Amino acid sequence: SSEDRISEIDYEFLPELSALLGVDAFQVAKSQEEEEHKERMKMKKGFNSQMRSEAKRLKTFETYDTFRSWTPQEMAAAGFYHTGVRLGVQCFCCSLILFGNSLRKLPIERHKKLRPECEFLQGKDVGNIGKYDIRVKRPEKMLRGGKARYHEEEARLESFEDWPFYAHGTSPRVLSAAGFVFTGKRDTVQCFSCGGSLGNWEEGDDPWKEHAKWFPKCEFLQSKKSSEEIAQYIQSYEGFVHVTGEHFVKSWVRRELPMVSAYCNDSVFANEELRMDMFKDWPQESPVGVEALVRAGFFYTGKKDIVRCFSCGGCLEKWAEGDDPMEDHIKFFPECVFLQTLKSQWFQEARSLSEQLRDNYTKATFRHMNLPEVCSSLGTDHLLSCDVSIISKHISQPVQEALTIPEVFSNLNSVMCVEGETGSGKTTFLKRIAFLWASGCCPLLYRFQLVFYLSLSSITPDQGLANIICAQLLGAGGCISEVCLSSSIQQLQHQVLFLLDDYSGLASLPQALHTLITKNYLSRTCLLIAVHTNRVRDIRLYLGTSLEIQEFPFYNTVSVLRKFFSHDIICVEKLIIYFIDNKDLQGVYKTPLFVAAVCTDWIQNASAQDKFQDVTLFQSYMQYLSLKYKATAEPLQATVSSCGQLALTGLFSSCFEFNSDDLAEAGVDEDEKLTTLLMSKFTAQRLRPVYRFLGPLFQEFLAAVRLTELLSSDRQEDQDLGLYYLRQIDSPLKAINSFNIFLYYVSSHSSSKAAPTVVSHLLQLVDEKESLENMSENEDYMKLHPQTFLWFQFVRGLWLVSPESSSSFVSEHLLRLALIFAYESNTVAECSPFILQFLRGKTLALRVLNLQYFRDHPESLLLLRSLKVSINGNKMSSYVDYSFKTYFENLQPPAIDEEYTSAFEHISEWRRNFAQDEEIIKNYENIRPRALPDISEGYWKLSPKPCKIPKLEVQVNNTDAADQALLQVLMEVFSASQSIEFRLFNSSGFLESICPALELSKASVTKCSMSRLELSRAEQELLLTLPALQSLEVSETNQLPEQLFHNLHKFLGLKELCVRLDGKPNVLSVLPREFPNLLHMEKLSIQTSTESDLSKLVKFIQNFPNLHVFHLKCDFLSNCESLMAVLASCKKLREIEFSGRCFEAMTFVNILPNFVSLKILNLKDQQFPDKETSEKFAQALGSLRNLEELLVPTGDGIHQVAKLIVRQCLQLPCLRVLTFHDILDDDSVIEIARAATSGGFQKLENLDISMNHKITEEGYRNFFQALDNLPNLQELNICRNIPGRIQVQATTVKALGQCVSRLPSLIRLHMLSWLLDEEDMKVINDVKERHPQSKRLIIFWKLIVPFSPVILE
Amino acid sequence: MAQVINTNSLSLLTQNNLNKSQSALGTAIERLSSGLRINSARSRIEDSDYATEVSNMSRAQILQQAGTSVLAQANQVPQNVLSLLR
């Protein structure tokens, strides 16, 4: 089982990942390793004979994802071809499958560590010719017999006896019938036909076709098939269209290092000849050991004794003179690499020109990438293994193909201009071709002898050919005549590539170079022309295929960063972790120019340890542009301002498509040299110009730069334009979600002047009444970051559950933005007024105490209303709710039509969805640590009594035990609060776990809320002993506390208490008569399905000094009239909320008809059927004025005097919530049109008409046709009346009220019986997308049902 | 100290941490999914529908919450898988 199983995770660097990523790489690591083992076993194993060559291995990497860490080139060099099963590369020799790239350097090290028996690593003939392999091998007959000694198939079929197992698909019989003769090497089959030693054979290919394609002079093929067949087969594929077999023999480009394992040549430091600067640093004129460190094959990077080899790049060190390494590195040195290998005359002018081209291209200055001197200080030749993507466009058809480097290198026979962005990799790609044509590591270019690389922007329209050649490629080395230099192009007709750079700004090319690019009838030379995307139309009329330099793949950038920051690798891991969740920013690295900017910023400004790296990237790109274009500083500033104005026009209109009119309106000229970096003129369909920038996010950063240079400018017109474009950010959602990265880009510049302006604008976005409808942002700009869609949905959900907490989240992020502005620009002193005014009345969390604004400015804590904390504890929460009864048991006909089946979701389906949600939550948090609050930094450990926050509402998540590290934080932070509220939900036992915490600060409590739990005697004493307590709340308890609750009646300085209870409660009689401390009642909440009340007849219920809330109730039978005759007595009791038949016939006449002191006496849940009792009751209850949430009670025959009741309710000009319950006569329904609502009630917000019986005649109509500017009804919840109405009333309401609007506020729709077919759900979706509530409106129409739907078929 | 660097910027790891922790209400309704189904009454003509919609309206609101939160967290659990995958 040792060989069957395999582990791909090394535990040496697992704590580092635990520290960085924030979770131990143990659980997910083991799970992933197991899954990889299972599917690796499942997948096919064996010797993949056909695609054994690295050419095909890289050809299978077209579908490979570009977000990786190991480059496809290295993966294929180690033999890891793309199997196609979630990037599961495989050792082609032994089927060692590595599902994921990782550290252990190049894949070879991990290969050896995991399975050291892939015979790949033995050096024997296994069939691993290189990625740039040429099928035509060299002719080395050296045999007895010559060309013509044998003439029979059986004469030479004996040679194929030793046929390798890696070429079994091509049977020896067909090869012998094709004239092929085996030699003895791997597959170097020296054909009987005039040598023809070509061969690299794979199953499925035609030896006849290959023989025709590479040899037209084969006498054997000429005899077997006619010249018609020869010419038919020569057109089978596009390859070496002008190269015979004799060109490769004496080719001026030849091999340098073996490619059997093509890793000892992937590095430029492979051979000694490719290390002239790295080798001959010691001058030959010195009397010292000039060749001490040269002949050993060790590449030296300018460091005194730090020398490394090419055998495996070993760390053989500490010589300083050229002696043996037998001093310090004897053995067992860390990360050993070295021991892994050793222990186990018109043509002669062209020839000289090619030699000098190769010598100049091997030079360090040309070969090294155009990195900044900070980046390119060391030899940047470890990044040469990085290539760019290539795509060929058809002649006229819109069909494009993705070709790898071997494909493109093979297919070079006509004009194919290279296209992209400014410096997007045309120069790098063309230099790479010029260098791989000379380094020998690309046998595909053993044909080319006069590959030419030139920049066409440095050439006058009347220059020559050898003049430019000597002035741009040879320097002073050119002294030969041009008489035969322009004849070598005709003596070497097609094998001449042109790497033309900077052709963009050319219209009249030099005449000497005009006979080779204009007509392809005689020269037919390959063309590789570097053209920006803004100037393709010049050549597009004259192309067969056209190359494009696509996006730099992310793994190339990752590789470059790894090579650079090899010591501080942890920072690169942090960057990778950043871009893993920043999926929107994976494509930000548009260019090796961007990569260079990031590297330079990291090295210089020490921004490596910066939590955000896209901001660093774009700021570094701006710094690069400013440093390079500092001579033309004013033109650069004008271009930046104009292009950022273009971005302001576009993105703020959610547009990225730009034309000549838009660009001219912005202010950019279409003929500026340096505007290409900020504009590319794309030809949209075929001839209509359109404009796209260097990157789609560089445009957003451009907008940021334009905004800061407009707001930080002295011109009043500039300030007005900047403010005009600010004002379009009129929603906090834009600043928090979409333009959040944009505003962070703005803040990246330490703008002293612009920071107060931006801070005032941002903190003015939230006021008493903001235009929240502006949160509906257009989706095209949100398509730039899909994380904006994700976070927008999250903020929207947080909005629908709890607008206060959603506002707290948005305000916390807005304050983080404002403080980032203030501290980055060091403008805290003048931002203090705006920041204080914003923070006044805020309700942020506890983490906001860890920003510097409360250590630098401790006093600011006095302005916040609260700083709440909550810890996500875990427990089984063994509870029994009663939502199952009366709602999951009875009334179960699911009669349906089966055309509306999407309306009803079975409880099984929603339970499955919830289980999946809990599974992803558990995957996230089980690996997570306990996640204690972060109070580590500073401020809290201060001596001189800074301040005391108003409210520290605590609410732990279903926790009953305070850990040793949790209770300490609780008791340390509770002392900071002058009023510690208590929110304890399902915390029956956490009370004594916070008893030590509360003991030191018992008085500072003000409210203790207890929701649906059972208390203990050992903890109830604390609640009874809260001296300066204002409130205590116990609610949602479903069982009477006959003996479990010890004693809750005698507080010390009580101001209010609540013992709310459900089930069959008699709380007006439980907790026996002794109630010593009921002295200063303020706020009590006890719903009671009363069973006994006489215990509290002459008790406190009349002694209420300043009582506010009264959430009482009376439900079934227990002396309702007596209880509410003794309880309706109010002196100043404001809120008397109720949930059922609260009053009675003659026991609601004492003071409610003739008083004012009420606030939130609510009557939503009233329903009784008795007629005469309600008729004889509602003459009383009169009118009030200070009431706020009075709702209408029930009564079947009550309407006759309820009309007068609502008439008196019109005298209540302070209400906000109402019900208008159960009107039946339908002749008093007109009374409540202007009664209370509309005709008065200047600040009514909510109006719920739940479960009415007689909204059929007008009902809905008076609330939808007679509105007439009642603009404060923000919550109109009108549930339908399936047993009280018909149907078409809803349709008429939708047609009239929705169309007329007339209310700038409303609330969403209703449910429980109403569903229709799927065709018009699209209609209602379109209607939702019509009016501006589109991006916020949710239509509730899905009923999560416990019954499986039944079709009435 | 933090006068030239935006150190207070949420790293999109801590942003998800407060996404999970500083949520609106937590698990006051998510647990009804497990509670309701496991492995006399007073249901009258009017005592059968007690405005059960809001319970389902709240259920759908917090289902949207859970969908959004687990989308943010299914953009973050793959962090652990892909970082080992590098």
mmCIF file of all heavy atoms in Angstrom, chain A residues 690-702:
data_model
loop_
_atom_site.group_PDB
_atom_site.id
_atom_site.type_symbol
_atom_site.label_atom_id
_atom_site.label_comp_id
_atom_site.label_asym_id
_atom_site.label_seq_id
_atom_site.Cartn_x
_atom_site.Cartn_y
_atom_site.Cartn_z
ATOM 1 N N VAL A 690 -13.154 51.752 -32.324
ATOM 2 C CA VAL A 690 -13.610 51.818 -30.941
ATOM 3 C C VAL A 690 -12.366 51.846 -30.063
ATOM 4 O O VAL A 690 -11.274 51.466 -30.486
ATOM 5 C CB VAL A 690 -14.541 50.640 -30.564
ATOM 6 C CG1 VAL A 690 -13.743 49.448 -30.064
ATOM 7 C CG2 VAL A 690 -15.564 51.080 -29.540
ATOM 8 N N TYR A 691 -12.528 52.322 -28.830
ATOM 9 C CA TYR A 691 -11.387 52.609 -27.970
ATOM 10 C C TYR A 691 -11.477 51.812 -26.677
ATOM 11 O O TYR A 691 -12.476 51.895 -25.955
ATOM 12 C CB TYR A 691 -11.295 54.106 -27.677
ATOM 13 C CG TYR A 691 -10.878 54.914 -28.881
ATOM 14 C CD1 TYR A 691 -11.823 55.445 -29.746
ATOM 15 C CD2 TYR A 691 -9.538 55.130 -29.165
ATOM 16 C CE1 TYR A 691 -11.447 56.178 -30.850
ATOM 17 C CE2 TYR A 691 -9.153 55.864 -30.266
ATOM 18 C CZ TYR A 691 -10.112 56.384 -31.106
ATOM 19 O OH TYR A 691 -9.734 57.114 -32.206
ATOM 20 N N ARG A 692 -10.425 51.045 -26.393
ATOM 21 C CA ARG A 692 -10.238 50.362 -25.124
ATOM 22 C C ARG A 692 -8.827 50.650 -24.631
ATOM 23 O O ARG A 692 -7.908 50.847 -25.426
ATOM 24 C CB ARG A 692 -10.455 48.844 -25.247
ATOM 25 C CG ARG A 692 -11.513 48.437 -26.263
ATOM 26 C CD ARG A 692 -11.609 46.926 -26.381
ATOM 27 N NE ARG A 692 -12.111 46.319 -25.155
ATOM 28 C CZ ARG A 692 -13.397 46.175 -24.864
ATOM 29 N NH1 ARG A 692 -14.344 46.570 -25.698
ATOM 30 N NH2 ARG A 692 -13.740 45.619 -23.705
ATOM 31 N N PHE A 693 -8.660 50.678 -23.315
ATOM 32 C CA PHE A 693 -7.409 51.133 -22.730
ATOM 33 C C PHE A 693 -6.429 49.969 -22.589
ATOM 34 O O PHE A 693 -6.669 48.858 -23.069
ATOM 35 C CB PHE A 693 -7.674 51.823 -21.392
ATOM 36 C CG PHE A 693 -8.214 53.223 -21.524
ATOM 37 C CD1 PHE A 693 -8.826 53.644 -22.694
ATOM 38 C CD2 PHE A 693 -8.104 54.119 -20.475
ATOM 39 C CE1 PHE A 693 -9.318 54.928 -22.813
ATOM 40 C CE2 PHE A 693 -8.595 55.404 -20.589
ATOM 41 C CZ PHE A 693 -9.203 55.808 -21.759
ATOM 42 N N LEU A 694 -5.295 50.231 -21.929
ATOM 43 C CA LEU A 694 -4.290 49.195 -21.713
ATOM 44 C C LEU A 694 -4.852 48.058 -20.869
ATOM 45 O O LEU A 694 -4.535 46.885 -21.098
ATOM 46 C CB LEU A 694 -3.062 49.809 -21.045
ATOM 47 C CG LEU A 694 -1.777 48.996 -20.901
ATOM 48 C CD1 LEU A 694 -0.891 49.174 -22.116
ATOM 49 C CD2 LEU A 694 -1.044 49.417 -19.647
ATOM 50 N N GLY A 695 -5.680 48.389 -19.885
ATOM 51 C CA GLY A 695 -6.423 47.411 -19.130
ATOM 52 C C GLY A 695 -7.771 47.968 -18.724
ATOM 53 O O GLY A 695 -7.960 49.186 -18.640
ATOM 54 N N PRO A 696 -8.743 47.090 -18.469
ATOM 55 C CA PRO A 696 -10.067 47.576 -18.051
ATOM 56 C C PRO A 696 -10.085 48.143 -16.645
ATOM 57 O O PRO A 696 -11.013 48.888 -16.310
ATOM 58 C CB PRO A 696 -10.962 46.335 -18.169
ATOM 59 C CG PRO A 696 -10.042 45.159 -18.311
ATOM 60 C CD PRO A 696 -8.622 45.627 -18.379
ATOM 61 N N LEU A 697 -9.093 47.821 -15.817
ATOM 62 C CA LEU A 697 -8.981 48.377 -14.475
ATOM 63 C C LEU A 697 -7.953 49.489 -14.377
ATOM 64 O O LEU A 697 -8.060 50.346 -13.488
ATOM 65 C CB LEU A 697 -8.636 47.275 -13.473
ATOM 66 C CG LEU A 697 -9.874 46.653 -12.841
ATOM 67 C CD1 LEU A 697 -9.600 45.246 -12.353
ATOM 68 C CD2 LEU A 697 -10.311 47.549 -11.701
ATOM 69 N N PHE A 698 -6.961 49.494 -15.267
ATOM 70 C CA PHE A 698 -6.104 50.663 -15.387
ATOM 71 C C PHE A 698 -6.917 51.894 -15.755
ATOM 72 O O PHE A 698 -6.554 53.009 -15.377
ATOM 73 C CB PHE A 698 -5.013 50.416 -16.422
ATOM 74 C CG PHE A 698 -4.039 51.541 -16.543
ATOM 75 C CD1 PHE A 698 -3.451 52.082 -15.416
ATOM 76 C CD2 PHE A 698 -3.712 52.061 -17.782
ATOM 77 C CE1 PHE A 698 -2.553 53.120 -15.521
ATOM 78 C CE2 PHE A 698 -2.813 53.103 -17.895
ATOM 79 C CZ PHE A 698 -2.232 53.633 -16.762
ATOM 80 N N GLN A 699 -8.030 51.710 -16.468
ATOM 81 C CA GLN A 699 -8.938 52.821 -16.734
ATOM 82 C C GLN A 699 -9.583 53.335 -15.450
ATOM 83 O O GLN A 699 -9.742 54.548 -15.270
ATOM 84 C CB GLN A 699 -10.004 52.392 -17.741
ATOM 85 C CG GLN A 699 -11.011 53.476 -18.068
ATOM 86 C CD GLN A 699 -11.267 53.599 -19.550
ATOM 87 O OE1 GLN A 699 -10.985 52.681 -20.318
ATOM 88 N NE2 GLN A 699 -11.797 54.743 -19.964
ATOM 89 N N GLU A 700 -9.973 52.430 -14.549
ATOM 90 C CA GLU A 700 -10.532 52.858 -13.270
ATOM 91 C C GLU A 700 -9.488 53.588 -12.431
ATOM 92 O O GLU A 700 -9.788 54.605 -11.789
ATOM 93 C CB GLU A 700 -11.090 51.650 -12.519
ATOM 94 C CG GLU A 700 -11.558 51.942 -11.110
ATOM 95 C CD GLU A 700 -12.037 50.697 -10.394
ATOM 96 O OE1 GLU A 700 -13.078 50.144 -10.801
ATOM 97 O OE2 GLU A 700 -11.373 50.272 -9.425
ATOM 98 N N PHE A 701 -8.251 53.091 -12.430
ATOM 99 C CA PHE A 701 -7.184 53.799 -11.728
ATOM 100 C C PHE A 701 -6.916 55.160 -12.366
ATOM 101 O O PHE A 701 -6.602 56.133 -11.669
ATOM 102 C CB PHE A 701 -5.916 52.951 -11.712
ATOM 103 C CG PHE A 701 -4.869 53.458 -10.774
ATOM 104 C CD1 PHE A 701 -5.048 53.357 -9.407
ATOM 105 C CD2 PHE A 701 -3.710 54.037 -11.250
ATOM 106 C CE1 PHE A 701 -4.090 53.819 -8.533
ATOM 107 C CE2 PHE A 701 -2.752 54.499 -10.379
ATOM 108 C CZ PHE A 701 -2.940 54.392 -9.020
ATOM 109 N N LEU A 702 -7.024 55.240 -13.693
ATOM 110 C CA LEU A 702 -6.936 56.517 -14.392
ATOM 111 C C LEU A 702 -8.021 57.471 -13.928
ATOM 112 O O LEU A 702 -7.775 58.668 -13.752
ATOM 113 C CB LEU A 702 -7.050 56.283 -15.896
ATOM 114 C CG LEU A 702 -5.799 55.872 -16.655
ATOM 115 C CD1 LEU A 702 -6.034 56.021 -18.141
ATOM 116 C CD2 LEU A 702 -4.672 56.765 -16.223
#
